[PDB]
């Protein structure tokens, strides 16, 4: 395949050239501004990826690459509605540079863009893409409401959040794979195995962004770091901790104080200590397995793709670099 | 045809039958809630009748009729958290039962489904069927904006209002019919000269809502009388109202009050006087030949397409009875 | 006994004379205000009559019937403040005179209050009053809690409800009869059949409450008539009206209506239209059926008391009065 | 008399199983929730100090001891209610974690539940515990009324604070050590010896958390330094410092400043400056002065009771180590 | 003098001409649109008036005429915004129309503009007219103080109530006469001849609009009936309804009902029933003879200033015409 | 002239001496507590120095100096209630002490106080005194609205903003010395000479400013620093800045940000990011020049006076000081 860094660049060529929709500009202005944030866009490189692996050019894939990252990016417009989010990547989200209605709206207008995008395809492959697709977009609607429900549960399992995760964060990267292998024209079964690679890398990529939300180095206009802390958000990390007995009540108690019942120094002290039961409890170290175990499934995965050895090569550390291993 | 009562029996029954998603039931409950809502289902039903008069079934069309459906309750789904809607059809709307989030979410879930009523067809009409529906869905987002956009307009042309109808309500009044004309295999040109209908129809229909919503007989679980006036919608109504030098300048002052500055007594007699204004100026009897005007174009289109003369006997019948017109 | 009319002015006398506290007056001052929103003092009159029935004076039971009425202001105080009443009795709430701080405070102080009214009574009869009284209290509490639990239930049985009411309305009427009894010296089993006379009293006269609000005579500056309606609070009328299964879908569907999301007009035509079902469905008469057979066991009760026949005539004229019938 | 250690192991064993009540929850849940904040329980155990220094055991007063601490309780939740507190103990507050209603309801029940665990006392005992209880619980509402009294007027005089935290904070002490008193069969005249000694313990208490709200060492879930300086609260340190001609002018400006006017930096600044002049004029010595002079005042008080040479010397060490002196 | 319809034209042709700032339109706009709500323009044709009967012309009074009408506007604006008022003659006040900000800035360049039209006058003139346009100025802010400050009094007597209505409402009125009496040239002893008959007009006149807010008839656009007693405001038609001691407890107790605690029939309740106890108070009556008494003192008044007959019949019959009597 | 120190002391016995209005306290004690707020008093200060250097008095130009005084304090009352400010000069803004219908009235009031202050001048100076006070105030009143209808610009060029900082601060400060130069009987000529220097002294001072918001030293109850980078005011600074095509396009994405979007730590780092792009883009050095350059001109414009070369001296130290340089 090439480089990630070419793909990019042909991704972004491309996207400018494809969303070309201005008018009325009350609808059209935030899908330019969202998808303009910036970052490593790395949901339409896989489709990219998938399909030069298996035969097709990156300039076959595009169109469904970037309907990819436009349904991506009108799951982030809505989610940062739902979840009140005033900044994303160092911007105003959509709903506060304009309103909650405009959010509403140019979602809506860009989950139907992405549909078309697919409308240049064989009447083959654009069957098997909407197919693919709309089971994904489904599925991460799932996603988002189990993990509302969540919200207020007192009793969720490893294996529910997992489930979760899967539909929420996973389901659209074995999509992204899938679509590409659709577009150089390879059969279910193999379809479903560049999928299940996905699945297993979208995993672990998740259960490193729960590790990394209570351990990660702090970014100003990055992500908070404690936030699932503060927001009692019960993680792969709070649920392992918990398993511990010793652990388990002062987690329970700490996970029960709503932020806005607490000052500044409150809450860094909820994530100081908070973090320290990860330590203590095993709960981290739990946390570093599963994503070391779903990495070597992906990595086992990547073994029995139809590719060429060089494509395992470039796949396998690309999988790597991206859970900040190295090749 | 089958008659109207009976296509809606059958209906009803093959939403109930293919409409089942029920788990999580945060996101698909409120799915059951607005589809049970009940009326007259027009546009599913356009769908079975254009299906019908071009040789097919309705069974055949039926899974086209629901997305058609679905995809109409999305966009109320939404319109009424945009519009802050208290109730619909007599009952709770959707984000005043549950909750905002719900609204959006369950909305986004629902466009969705509608894409995956296609799944049964053909590859050729699969593909036909979300190429019309993917530009009809856009065409009512761009419609949602300008209207919104109009609100803070001070010189709009009657022009931009019929377009901006057109696109809202009108253009998947031509999508429900031209789908039923790509399950019986009809050619672009036919599906265009029903899709024309189609237009003329919505449009008159429209127009019709303009009208009733001054004039119309009060319903207390019903539409609001006046609603347009108490709002300051710059409707045909109004439009044709102010062409008219003599109202015109005290149309447009009623025009700049806003109901939170008044009180009912206020809002009501805001109501009668405007409605005088509507009479006087000419505006109510020109907003009645416009309904009467693309009822004609309507009748025309009907007299044109390649159907039984039973087909456009029966169309005609439905287009007059649809504008509370007798056959 | 004496006359209603003549407990009533000596009571309003020894109630002037034995509530004299006065500072600080942002304690004190609430306390009058709430003992002078007049009426019929239903429930300190009651301790008197029974006093004097069994032999003691109004002037022995006097302190214990002042108790009495501070206990049940005390709770009229907590209430309006936990259900957000404007006015009482024509007049403006203490947390909406004063505020809310004011109303849980007073409150508090109007409790601890009527405990000391008890002080001058001897050792023995000091330790009755406090034991039935303090079980009174709670159970109140505790009827309070069962009514705010029924609020998010959609699955409330008449015998909850029954037993809901009977803690919330009619302990505190047995508890002011038994009182008058301890006063006098009766004994335990004497003074727990005066108690179950008012408890069936009270429960008929709460289920005549149900009955007034949907169908009593409108007062501008009294009771709103349908407030339980608006409220959609599950009382004895509503409860019997779903027994009717040709009823019972509609009044669910009226009872999931806010009145939050609804206009006047829209209140007002639910509350006639409730009424109508309310009727149709045998709800009402199985009401006035309920209210009447409570009257009838408490005259019954009234047969088997030990006092004098006369004592019976007047007690019994007075139960009858008290339910708007006549003697 | 036991060790604290011993009577606090008994007090916490008795308390869970004399506190039984758990239906209906929405009632009774809150009770258990406050009750199992922790602490020193400094109270209920004055109650089995007193018991057994005059001869009693801890087991006869124990449902008195536990009375005094649900009646403690009730006062916290109704006062974490209208000072809006959001954290008690490092907890959410009932009203907080429940709502207010809850709160409301839930105190009123705590208070009624006191009462109710004098009933296993001789009549005698019951009518003494109940007079001095209610006497202590009305002043405990007077000295609430005065500190809110306080906060809208600029000429609050020494005299009148020291009245109100004796009605507020010290009565209870007193009151506390009488009922243990009252158990144990001692007269009138050695009762208010006792409780005088409660007082004078109690003022030298409340002084001292005067003095640790701007001098004491900062803990994140414990009180926080300078609170009352951000309020504005006129305590005995700031009545003190404002007696200086030199510090009053720029003390009462810094006093006018409300905190919802001010950034964090400026309310930080604010307390720095405060309790600089609180030590420069005399105001923090002049406390101080005081506390030592109320433990003094208690020491005596303690000498002239009629308890066992030990029994005076366990109360002297008991009352230094309360202070933060040693023995 | 010239009739008023022909002040009147001659005064809106000058108001025009002599208002031209439109730059920037953020600060200008509300001037003109506030300047042309209509109306009878009282004040300043006044000032006409006073300028032709003692020998000068309306042309030569014109700059003062609109600086009194420009403050006057001045005065509303602010009042507007403090009262919060929605509407003004039937349209949008200019702080709904805009924002609060725009009022207050928009109303303080229109007093500044008021002073500039006195700068074509002669010095002495000019002297004279900015020292009593001031002075006046002041007054009406005190008043306006007054009238805020009787809000929180109980206890408000007719003579400092109609210092406060002198000051709010009538100086200007003497103020505007004695402008149009320094533009003739005439005498300090005259000045004050022609104010003080403006001060018995203005004292009419406002106890005039009194009596009319509960006894004048309804309009729409107008001013609510009854909204002194919805407000509680304690016009001279309370003071006087309140000295009759068979009245004065229950007029306290509706005078004590806040509107936001009542429902409108309970507001339209207590207006009817406060109408009626200013009736049979002798309230009512007592309001007309104060407003006959200051309009004969008037009338005195204007028979005693150096004009010609004529133009003394003028002032009489546009006396009486204001107090809606007959010539 | 005298010292600044002298002319101060002398200023604030006159000041107390002629500002006497007491009653109604609700109007008048927010007068005397905004003009006891303390600093410089540099526009009053101003008045004095220019009726001195022309050979006037002090005593002369006193009631000149305080109208001045009283003026720029009423812009301050309106200014803190349009831009919500919580504190003036490290105590509670008028608004926060009172409320916002006290700082509006308040405000009307002081203006009035101010034109009132003329009248002791005799007719030829009253007349002069009033015109250049007025065009001033106007000019004042025009500058605070260019100042908002910035905000909502993204084009505003240098010469707009120099434009609105003379008339919203500079105007003000040449009327000040033109003051002083009439009442000292100076020519039109002269007085047009003073006033420019007043103008260029006035266009430094608020360029110095401009810089010293951002550069400035931090004082906790003095001028919060990066205040107008917090608020994206487009102050000279940032104009400049962006003239730079290597810094612009960062600094309008961070001038994009509002600060309800972003944590203490997220305005932090704007703060010094934008301070860095302030010094880097030439934008802090384009001030200081403009600052210097405009305190040249004011010292050619001081060479130019008909006044002693003492004076000039005098002046010109006092100008080098108020631009914290050193004579
Ligand atoms: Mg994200
Ligand atoms: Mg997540
Ligand atoms: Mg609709
Ligand atoms: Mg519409
Ligand atoms: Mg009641
Ligand atoms: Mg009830
Ligand atoms: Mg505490
Ligand atoms: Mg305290
Ligand atoms: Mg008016
Ligand atoms: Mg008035
Ligand atoms: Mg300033
Ligand atoms: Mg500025």
Same mark, same amino acid.
């Not at 860094?5 to 494809?18: A, D, G, I, N, Q």
């Not at 201005?22 to 899908?31: F, I, K, N, R, S």
């Not at 910036?38 to 035969?55: D, F, H, Q, V």
């Not at 010793?246 to 860094?268: G, R, S, V, Y």
């Given at each position: 395949? =090439?480089?990630?860094?070419?793909?990019?660049?042909?991704?972004? /060529?491309?996207?400018?050239?494809?969303?070309?929709?201005? !008018?009325?500009?009350?609808? %059209?202005?935030?899908?330019?501004?969202?998808? #303009?944030?910036?970052?490593?866009?790395?949901?339409?490189?896989?489709?990219?990826?998938?399909?030069?692996?298996?035969?097709?050019?990156?300039?076959?894939?595009?169109?469904?690459?970037?309907?990819?990252?436009?349904?991506?990016?009108?799951?982030?417009?809505?989610? #940062?509605?739902?979840?009140?989010?005033?900044?994303?990547?160092? *911007?105003?989200?959509?709903? *506060?540079?304009?309103?909650?209605?405009?959010?509403?709206?140019?979602?809506?207008?860009?989950?139907?863009?992405?549909?078309?995008? &697919? !409308?240049?395809?064989?009447?083959?492959? +654009?069957?098997?893409?909407?197919?693919? +697709?709309?089971?994904?977009?489904? !599925?991460?609607? !799932?996603?988002?409401?189990? #993990?509302?429900?969540?919200?207020?549960?007192?009793?969720?399992?490893?294996? /529910?959040?997992?489930?979760? @995760?899967?539909?929420?964060?996973?389901?659209?990267?074995?999509?992204?794979?899938?679509?590409?292998?659709?577009?150089?024209?390879?059969?279910?079964?193999?379809?479903?195995? @560049?999928?299940?690679?996905?699945? =297993?890398?979208? $995993?672990?990529?998740?259960?490193?962004?729960?590790?990394?939300?209570? +351990?990660?180095?702090?970014?100003?206009?990055?992500?908070?770091?404690?936030?699932? @802390?503060?927001?009692?958000?019960?993680?792969?990390? %709070?649920?392992?901790? @918990?398993?511990?007995?010793?652990?388990?009540?002062?987690?329970?108690?700490? &996970?029960? $104080?709503?932020?806005?019942?607490?000052?500044?120094?409150?809450?860094?002290?909820? *994530?100081?200590?908070?973090?320290?039961?990860?330590?203590?409890?095993?709960?981290?170290?739990?946390?570093?397995?599963?994503?070391?175990?779903?990495?070597?499934?992906?990595?086992?995965?990547?073994?029995?793709?139809?590719?060429?050895?060089?494509?395992?090569?470039?796949?396998?550390?690309?999988?790597?670099?991206?859970?900040?291993?190295?090749?």
């Amino acid at each position: 395949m =090439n480089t990630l860094k070419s793909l990019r660049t042909t991704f972004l /060529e491309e996207l400018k050239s494809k969303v070309t929709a201005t !008018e009325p500009a009350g609808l %059209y202005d935030p899908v330019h501004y969202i998808l #303009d944030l910036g970052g490593k866009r790395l949901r339409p490189l896989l489709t990219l990826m998938s399909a030069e692996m298996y035969g097709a050019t990156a300039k076959d894939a595009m169109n469904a690459a970037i309907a990819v990252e436009v349904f991506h990016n009108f799951t982030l417009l809505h989610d #940062d509605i739902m979840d009140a989010a005033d900044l994303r990547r160092g *911007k105003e989200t959509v709903h *506060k540079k304009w309103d909650v209605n405009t959010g509403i709206l140019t979602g809506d207008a860009m989950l139907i863009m992405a549909y078309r995008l &697919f !409308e240049d395809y064989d009447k083959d492959k +654009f069957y098997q893409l909407n197919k693919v +697709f709309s089971r994904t977009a489904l !599925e991460v609607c !799932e996603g988002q409401q189990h #993990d509302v429900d969540f919200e207020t549960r007192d009793d969720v399992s490893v294996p /529910e959040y997992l489930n979760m @995760i899967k539909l929420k964060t996973s389901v659209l990267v074995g999509c992204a794979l899938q679509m590409g292998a659709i577009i150089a024209g390879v059969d279910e079964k193999e379809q479903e195995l @560049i999928y299940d690679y996905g699945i =297993n890398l979208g $995993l672990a990529f998740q259960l490193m962004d729960d590790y990394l939300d209570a +351990f990660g180095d702090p970014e100003t206009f990055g992500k908070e770091v404690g936030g699932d @802390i503060r927001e009692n958000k019960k993680t792969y990390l %709070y649920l392992k901790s @918990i398993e511990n007995n010793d652990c388990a009540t002062e987690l329970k108690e700490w &996970f029960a $104080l709503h932020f806005e019942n607490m000052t500044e120094e409150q809450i860094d002290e909820k *994530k100081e200590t908070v973090k320290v039961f990860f330590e203590q409890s095993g709960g981290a170290k739990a946390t570093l397995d599963a994503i070391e175990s779903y990495t070597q499934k992906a990595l086992k995965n990547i073994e029995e793709l139809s590719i060429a050895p060089e494509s395992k090569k470039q796949l396998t550390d690309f999988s790597l670099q991206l859970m900040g291993r190295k090749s």
